[PDB]
């Protein structure tokens, strides 16, 4: 712990050796033990400023970050024949209410006193768990629970055919056909497209599937009333045969044009009646029909900071899907510019997500192949919620003014989520609309109303309680550096689309300068409170990330995708991507968690992102959340080469090395135990590639050394020198 002050210019080794842990709100013991898990719901300032004036002085953003549908280990499910909610603001009775007349409770959000219905009340599950799931009564559904509906839309043009993506996708579907969430009501369908739209009829009475082709690009329609979206259970065999045939039907195709816009409209018409999840696979710029996009010249390290959609077609389309409870996930596997800035809209506004696989090729890109494989695996098997809405409530006085994430905001701030997935993150920015002079505690409550894959209307609720403070020092003491960095990244993405990349990068640097400056004016070197000792480091990382970097050679869609991730991912993965964990791994030992019964699990210390920490004498593992790169030094030990890599010398380490082998050596067991532990901390199996040699021309391992200097960016030290110059200007 500590209320100490740090001089950033003298420490320079402030990153801790062990994982960073979220701040613990300064709350009474009993209240804090009931608080919401920080992985599910957290605040950028665990000590909420009592006034907007106080908030503005600190120069730190106030907001919430949430991962509401996260996969839980244990979840309390209350089936109450009646759901207890405040008669005024409809808030769900929670652990932080105030029981007085033991038959009357005071709402922690609007202060109204309610009557506890005749149905030790403070012992009820609803008051003992901050996270809980309720069964929704008949009044919480606009229609009978919709069945699960999966519609797959595939690009099959010449380029798409050349990538070979269809084969793996169809193969992943076949293997997971029985794992797709749902009961006997599950429906599935397929559409392929090039210059035309191809539907597939499936009937047990016919000898084979029928390809119904709509060529009228300017006026799509559903060719058949039945058998396009078929019942999976009943037609399992017919779907399996199709998945086995598709990858072979377009081998010799000559179609170079892709009518994505019309195909999406037809897919929409097909799903409009029920709603569901549309999975679109595209490999190039759409150029035929409505929604066609113009080519663009990729930038270069030279071009300065001089983002937005070229058209609103996909946004309007995404809004239409949303009103019909249709979510659109986009899998872009393009080798050339495909205007993702415009295509991405289809997923942003319908609550879907975008998956990107730059230069995907069945033979040429063994890395993107396995990535898609593992990402599809998660995608097809993770839990899902249908036709959902989310509402975020906070105590009177606090107001949410900006929402971040993939959804569509309706009236009186209703978050429309056609689909709700367990890997999506959201963020909110708030302000103190009314001085909190009254209370000493404030609450935050998110309610997620959805239909399960089993057809049951459910409501998942998370409640967070935090203390209110009135001094500048208390605001700083409770600051959550990671949460603040996450909300700033989201704010910067909006600023980029709103003003420009330059304006975004500037506001990022000014949030650091403004905050330390405010700090300084209320206390020689660069002084910062303990809670913010990592603030400049994380912002610098953000500035060097693919979303905001400048002098680099990053391509257009790459930047957009990184921004899509900032907006759609949960805090934890944003941090892993922005500031990867680096560990030395050629000399692992026993200071680990050899507690896991029969496994030891080494716990090497986290190193800061600098080439000054590397060494040509060892090997280093970098955990970037989505991937794990293992760099091997040229002068690495012979023991590591033979006992871990299974090679006799550096020279013979296979170029693309998709993973480590499992050799019968104690050294192999250690590293493989370490890596196994890293990937067990998440649901998206992260691929590993040692390909990171000292000459594989894939040493993009270095781009993550955010602390060193580059020809077009400052080092960590320079950045600090710059901030100090501004702090005491």
């Amino acid at each position: 712990e500590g209320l100490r002050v740090v001089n950033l210019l003298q420490e320079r080794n402030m990153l801790p050796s062990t994982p960073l842990k979220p701040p613990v709100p300064n709350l009474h013991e009993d209240i804090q033990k009931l608080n919401c898990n920080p992985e599910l719901f957290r605040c950028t300032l665990t000590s909420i400023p009592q006034t907007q004036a106080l908030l503005n002085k600190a120069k730190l953003p106030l907001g919430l970050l949430l991962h509401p549908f996260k996969d839980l280990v244990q979840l309390p499910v209350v089936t109450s024949s009646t759901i207890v909610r405040c008669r005024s603001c409809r808030t769900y009775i929670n652990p932080f209410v105030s029981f007085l007349d033991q038959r009357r409770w005071k709402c922690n959000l609007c202060y109204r006193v309610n009557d506890v219905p005749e149905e030790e009340p403070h012992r009820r599950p609803e008051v003992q768990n901050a996270t809980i799931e309720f069964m929704a009564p008949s009044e919480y559904m606009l229609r009978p629970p919709q069945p699960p509906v999966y519609l797959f839309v595939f690009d099959v043009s010449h380029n798409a055919v050349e990538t070979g993506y269809l084969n793996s996708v169809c193969q992943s579907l076949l293997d997971n056909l029985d794992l797709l969430p749902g009961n006997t009501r599950t429906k599935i369908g397929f559409i392929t497209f090039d210059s035309t739209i191809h539907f597939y009829g499936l009937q047990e009475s016919l000898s084979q599937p029928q390809m119904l082709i709509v060529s009228d690009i300017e006026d799509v329609f559903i060719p058949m009333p039945e058998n396009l979206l078929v019942n999976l259970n009943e037609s399992k065999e017919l779907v399996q045969d199709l998945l086995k045939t598709l990858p072979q039907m377009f081998t010799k195709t000559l179609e170079t044009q892709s009518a994505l816009g019309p195909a999406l409209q037809a897919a929409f018409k097909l799903m409009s009646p029920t709603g569901g999840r549309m999975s679109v696979f595209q490999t190039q710029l759409p150029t035929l029909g409505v929604g066609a996009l113009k080519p663009r010249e990729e930038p270069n390290h030279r071009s300065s900071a001089k983002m937005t959609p070229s058209t609103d077609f996909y946004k309007k389309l995404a809004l239409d899907c949303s009103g019909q409870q249709v979510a659109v996930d986009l899998f872009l596997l393009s080798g050339q510019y495909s205007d993702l800035a415009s295509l991405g809209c289809i997923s942003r506004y319908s609550a879907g997500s975008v998956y990107y696989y730059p230069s995907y090729h069945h033979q040429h890109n063994p890395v993107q192949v396995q990535k898609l494989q593992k990402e599809l695996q998660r995608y097809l098997t993770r839990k899902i919620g249908f036709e959902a809405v989310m509402r975020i409530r906070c105590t009177k006085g606090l107001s949410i003014h900006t929402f971040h994430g993939n959804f569509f905001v309706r009236s009186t701030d209703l978050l429309s989520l056609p689909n709700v997935n367990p890997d999506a993150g959201y963020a909110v920015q708030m302000s103190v609309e009314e001085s909190l002079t009254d209370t000493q505690l404030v609450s935050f409550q998110s309610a997620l109303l959805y239909t399960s894959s089993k057809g049951e209307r459910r409501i998942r609720v998370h409640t967070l309680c935090l203390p209110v403070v009135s001094t500048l020092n208390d605001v700083f003491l409770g600051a959550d550096v990671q949460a603040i960095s996450g909300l700033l990244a989201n704010m910067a993405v909006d600023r980029s689309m709103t003003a420009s990349l330059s304006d975004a990068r500037d506001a990022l640097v000014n949030a650091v300068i403004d905050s330390l400056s405010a700090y300084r004016s209320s206390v020689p070197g660069l002084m910062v409170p303990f809670s913010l000792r990592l603030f400049p480091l994380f912002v610098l990382a953000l500035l060097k990330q693919k979303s905001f970097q400048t002098g680099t050679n990053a391509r257009l869609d790459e930047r957009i995708f990184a921004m899509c991730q900032v907006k759609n991912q949960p805090l934890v993965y944003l941090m892993l991507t922005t500031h990867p964990s680096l560990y030395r791994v050629d000399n692992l030992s026993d200071e680990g968690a050899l507690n896991i019964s029969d496994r030891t699990i080494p716990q090497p210390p986290i190193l800061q992102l600098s080439v000054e920490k590397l060494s040509r004498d060892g090997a280093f593992l970098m955990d970037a959340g989505s991937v794990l790169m293992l760099w091997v030094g040229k002068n690495c030990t012979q023991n590591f080469l033979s006992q871990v890599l299974g090679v006799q010398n550096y020279a013979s380490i296979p170029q693309p090395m998709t993973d480590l082998p499992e050799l019968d050596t104690p050294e192999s067991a250690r590293i493989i135990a370490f890596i196994s532990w890293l990937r067990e901390q998440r649901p998206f199996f992260p691929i590993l590639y040692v390909i990171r040699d000292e000459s594989p021309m894939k040493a993009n391992f270095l781009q993550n050394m955010i602390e060193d200097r580059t020809e077009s960016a400052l080092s960590y030290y320079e950045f600090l020198l710059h901030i100090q110059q501004q702090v005491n200007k």
């Binding site: 008949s138 009978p144 009501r185 057809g455 209307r457």
Partner: protein
């Protein structure tokens, strides 16, 4: 001569199973829930309501109401035959569990039978009252 089918427990009007397809539902779906709410042990066990261009048809068996909406033109004779097919199947399958459940649509899966029975009627190849009244 189209669709909208709802099966619910008479006592509380708890929904048990239903089927709908558009490509409004909103208005008539409320009226259906209005009926269910009104229905009780004294209600006619076989009735037909008139709602303008539309006409409701229902039957009550073992405390379970089988309602259906359609264009007034649709053959009244077929609507009831349709209801009878659903009843026998539903009562046979879940007839004994109905009085115990408590969650809405606890038999959503009955969704399938409904639609495979619905098509055998929407393809050519008792008492009357203005619903507006009962409500």
């Amino acid at each position: 001569m189209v669709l909208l089918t709802m099966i619910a427990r008479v006592a509380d009007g708890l929904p048990l199973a239903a089927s709908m397809q558009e490509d409004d539902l909103q208005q008539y779906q409320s009226q259906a829930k209005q009926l269910f709410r009104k229905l009780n042990e004294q209600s006619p066990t076989r009735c037909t309501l008139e709602a303008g261009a539309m006409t409701f048809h229902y039957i009550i068996e073992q405390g379970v109401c089988y309602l259906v909406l359609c264009e007034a033109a649709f053959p009244k004779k077929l609507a009831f035959a349709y209801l009878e097919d659903l009843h026998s199947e539903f009562d046979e399958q879940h007839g004994k569990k109905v009085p115990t459940v408590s969650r809405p649509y606890s038999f959503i899966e009955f969704d399938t039978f409904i639609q495979k029975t619905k098509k055998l009627y929407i393809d050519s190849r008792i008492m009357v009252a203005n619903i507006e009244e009962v409500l």
